[PDB]
Copies of this chain bind each other. A is one copy, B any other.
Amino acid sequence: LHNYGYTSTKSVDNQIEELREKVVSKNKNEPEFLQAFEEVLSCLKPVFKKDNVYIGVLENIAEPERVIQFRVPWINDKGEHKMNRGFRVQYNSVLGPYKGGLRFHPAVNLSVIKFLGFEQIFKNSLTTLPMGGGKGGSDFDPKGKSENEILKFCQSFMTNLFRYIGPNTDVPAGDIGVGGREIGYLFGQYKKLKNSFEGVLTGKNIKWGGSNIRAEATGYGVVYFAENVLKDLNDNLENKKCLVSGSGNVAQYLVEKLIEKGAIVLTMSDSNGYILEPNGFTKEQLNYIMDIKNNQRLRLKEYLKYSKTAKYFENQKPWNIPCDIAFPCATQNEINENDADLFIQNKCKMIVEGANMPTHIKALHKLKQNNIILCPSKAANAGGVAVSGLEMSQNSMRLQWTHQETDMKLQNIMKSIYEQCHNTSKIYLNESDLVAGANIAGFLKVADSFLEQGGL
């Protein structure tokens, strides 16, 4: 073995307590981070029992390999000299180059970034692709800024970051505040400085190093994940009454893939009210919703002028409808206890998380004690992160795979992500728990590699 501290007798629980204490004291004022930490810490008790080493390893991995913060100055259109704070947390590079998006939001700060970046490590880990974990951004607020100002900012932001990122070092991506438009400016500036065309950013337009399936990526992934849980029960998606919530990017393509398979997608939520449609939606109808939602930027009720057999319930959730599968694709905690009882009552057999952690901490308890399969968002929606890894591959190969090819790869990646949760949770809990499986599997790949590499 090795020695990463924690050699005492201390009940595995006391060591876990000692660690928590030590991590908290060093990061007193980083709530968001400390919370995402105490979270990963919970499900990792089984592995700690197998070997103490992991407790020390975790303490180490919880400490960003490196974090760069810098002043990003820019001149707005009124000729004013503004300033913002930029960050890039290169959390872990054990499995590959630091991977992680950039967030431009007024709420952004070190604590927030560490939180996001820390979680990225393991999410990436599951991918199977060689990707480390990272995250960056600024407290810059895109809202209200002109097109020109956004450009000026991106250029300045990249002028600082450019020297610390690279194809084999750190490959950033889009996130809140940083979309396609932004990635174009960032890339342009990077190319001008470094003087070379290379995959430093993922989510590039298709005309210059982008990948196919980037848009549909996450949604398709969620379905593929579920399709795998089902195939391991001699069943498939064909003819399953599905509940979907949200009408965002993920939600849309999720429905598109679902329809294309066995169909019977009954609903689609909105920031206020949802839509019903007995007999399920159809290819054609989804296009309308996509149009209305993308182009027409209209409320979801709108669909009502398009359907004969539609029905819009307002300020309510679709959870009291009987279904086989349910896809929480809106936002965090959209599923409380009352919703568990509702599901456990309509006999619902499975819930695949689309958005990040759409289930409430106490809601998972009832669901598990009622034998209702729960798919971790950490694994189910990793489809997006996975495709960006493929973008990196295509960039290195100097080729672009067909919409067809890229999809197939995503399907195998999803299949693998499933197998790992399944097998890992089985081996460590004796039962098949996807949620714990995702955490253990994700952590172990990193922890072991960390050890094999000398503990650097």
Contacts and interface: CB of A to CB of B under 8 A. Distances in A.
Interface of A: 1-5, 26, 28-29, 56, 59-60, 63-71, 73, 75, 77-83, 85, 93-97, 128-130, 132, 139, 147-148, 151-152, 154-155, 159-160, 163, 166-169, 184-185, 187-189, 191-193, 195-198, 205, 207-209, 389, 392-393, 396-400, 445, 448-449, 452-456
A452 B398 contact: no
A189 B81 contact: no
Contacts of A195: 163, 169
8 contacts: A3-B79, A4-B81, A67-B69, A67-B70, A81-B455, A97-B197, A168-B197, A169-B197
Contact of A196 (B26, B168, B185): B168
Contacts of A130: 197, 208-209, 398
Contact of A68 (B66, B207, B392): B66
4 nearest A-B residue pairs (beta carbon):
A188-B453, A188-B454, A168-B196, A63-B71
Contacts of A400: 128
B73 A455 contact: yes
Contacts of A2: 81
Contacts of A85: 26, 63
Nearest to A76: B3
A397 to B, nearest CB: 6
Contact of A3 (B78, B166, B398): B78
A445 B207 CA distance: 7
Contacts of A5: 80-82
Nearest to A395: B130
A452 B399 contact: no
B64 A69 contact: yes
Contacts of A69: 64, 66-69
A64 B208 CA distance: 19
A351 to B, nearest CB: 31
A132 B197 contact: yes
A132 B94 CA distance: 28
A85 B93 CA distance: 17
Given A64-B71, A96-B208, 10 more contacts: A3-B80, A4-B81, A63-B71, A64-B69, A73-B456, A159-B193, A169-B197, A185-B454, A192-B456, A207-B448
A197 B28 CA distance: 32
Query: Could you say which of A148, A160, A453 has the most chain B C-beta atoms within 10 Å of its C-beta?
Result: A453
Given A397-B393, A455-B73, A67 B64 contact: no
Contacts of A151: 75, 454
A193 B453 CA distance: 13
A108 to B, nearest CB: 11
Nearest to A75: B148
Given A68-B66, A79-B148, A168-B198, A452 B95 contact: no
A381 to B, nearest CB: 21
A453 B193 CA distance: 13
Given A3-B80, A83-B59, A163-B195, A29 B26 contact: no
Contacts of A397: 393, 396-397
